[PDB]
Design an enzyme around this catalytic site. Structure first.
Site, short mmCIF file in Angstrom:
data_model
loop_
_atom_site.label_atom_id
_atom_site.label_comp_id
_atom_site.label_asym_id
_atom_site.label_seq_id
_atom_site.Cartn_x
_atom_site.Cartn_y
_atom_site.Cartn_z
N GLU A 35 0.86 -1.22 0.00
CA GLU A 35 0.00 0.00 0.00
C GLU A 35 0.88 1.24 0.00
O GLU A 35 0.53 2.17 -0.70
CB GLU A 35 -0.91 -0.03 1.20
CG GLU A 35 -1.98 -1.06 1.20
CD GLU A 35 -3.12 -0.77 0.19
OE1 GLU A 35 -3.11 0.31 -0.49
OE2 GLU A 35 -3.92 -1.69 -0.13
N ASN A 46 -7.89 9.06 -5.50
CA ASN A 46 -8.71 8.10 -6.26
C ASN A 46 -9.58 8.88 -7.28
O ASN A 46 -9.83 10.03 -7.12
CB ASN A 46 -9.62 7.31 -5.33
CG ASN A 46 -8.87 6.65 -4.18
OD1 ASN A 46 -9.16 6.83 -2.96
ND2 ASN A 46 -7.99 5.87 -4.53
N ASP A 48 -12.74 8.80 -7.74
CA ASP A 48 -13.97 9.38 -7.13
C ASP A 48 -13.72 10.67 -6.41
O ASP A 48 -14.66 11.26 -5.94
CB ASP A 48 -14.75 8.35 -6.28
CG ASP A 48 -14.00 7.92 -5.03
OD1 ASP A 48 -12.89 8.40 -4.80
OD2 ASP A 48 -14.49 7.06 -4.30
N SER A 50 -11.86 10.86 -3.59
CA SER A 50 -11.43 10.54 -2.25
C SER A 50 -9.89 10.39 -2.36
O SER A 50 -9.30 10.33 -3.40
CB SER A 50 -12.08 9.25 -1.78
OG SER A 50 -11.67 8.14 -2.55
N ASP A 52 -6.45 8.31 -0.36
CA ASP A 52 -5.93 7.33 0.61
C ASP A 52 -4.72 7.85 1.37
O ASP A 52 -3.86 8.49 0.78
CB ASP A 52 -5.52 6.06 -0.13
CG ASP A 52 -6.67 5.41 -0.86
OD1 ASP A 52 -7.82 5.50 -0.53
OD2 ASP A 52 -6.39 4.59 -1.69
N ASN A 59 -8.96 5.23 3.38
CA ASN A 59 -9.68 6.11 2.44
C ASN A 59 -10.64 7.11 3.04
O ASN A 59 -11.35 6.80 3.99
CB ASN A 59 -10.42 5.19 1.44
CG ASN A 59 -11.17 5.95 0.42
OD1 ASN A 59 -12.36 6.22 0.59
ND2 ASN A 59 -10.50 6.34 -0.61
#
Ligand SMILES: [Cl-]
Ligand SMILES: [Cl-]
Ligand SMILES: [Cl-]
Length: 129
Positions: A35, A46, A48, A50, A52, A59
Site C-alpha cells: 500500500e 482516487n 472518485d 477521495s 488514501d 480512504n
C-alpha cells in the site's frame, strides 16, 4: 517516516495486530509494503475524488475527514492527516475498525491482489519479535 520491515512488524505487534481477527502479523506487514512502501506520509488520490492516507492507505470516502470528499463519512473519527504521523497508533486503531466491518482484509486492494494466499510469514522472518 519510512519504516524498516522488522521495525514495523514490531510496532504492529505492540499495537495488537498480530492475529487481530485472525490475521497473522505478516498479513499486516505485506499490506503496508504494497500500500505505502512502509512510508507513513504516502497519499494517493482516487478517481472518485477521495484520497488514501498513510501506511495502510485508509480512504477518506469512509474512514477519515479531509475536508474535501463531499458526502463522505468519518467512521474512525479522525482527520486524515492524523494517519500520516510517524506514530502509527491512529492508523492501527482505524485499521482494526475496518477489518471488523465484514470484508476482513479484502478492504485493502493490495492485500487481496498481492498478499492473500501467499506465504506471508516471509514478511516477518528474521525479525526479533
Ligand atoms: Cl505471519
Ligand atoms: Cl470522509
Ligand atoms: Cl475475515
Amino acid at each position: 517516516k519510512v519504516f524498516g520491515r522488522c521495525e514495523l512488524a514490531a510496532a504492529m505487534k505492540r499495537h495488537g495486530l498480530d492475529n487481530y481477527r485472525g490475521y497473522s502479523l505478516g498479513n499486516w506487514v505485506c499490506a503496508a509494503k504494497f500500500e505505502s512502501n512502509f512510508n507513513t506520509q504516502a497519499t494517493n488520490r482516487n478517481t472518485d475524488g477521495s484520497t488514501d492516507y498513510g501506511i495502510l492507505q485508509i480512504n477518506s470516502r469512509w474512514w477519515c475527514n479531509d475536508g474535501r470528499t463531499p458526502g463522505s463519512r468519518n467512521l474512525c473519527n479522525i482527520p486524515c492527516s492524523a494517519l500520516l504521523s510517524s506514530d502509527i497508533t491512529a492508523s492501527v486503531n482505524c485499521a482494526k475498525k475496518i477489518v471488523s466491518d465484514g470484508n476482513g482484509m479484502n478492504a485493502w486492494v493490495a492485500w487481496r491482489n498481492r498478499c492473500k494466499g501467499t506465504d506471508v510469514q516471509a514478511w516477518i522472518r528474521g525479525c526479533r519479535l
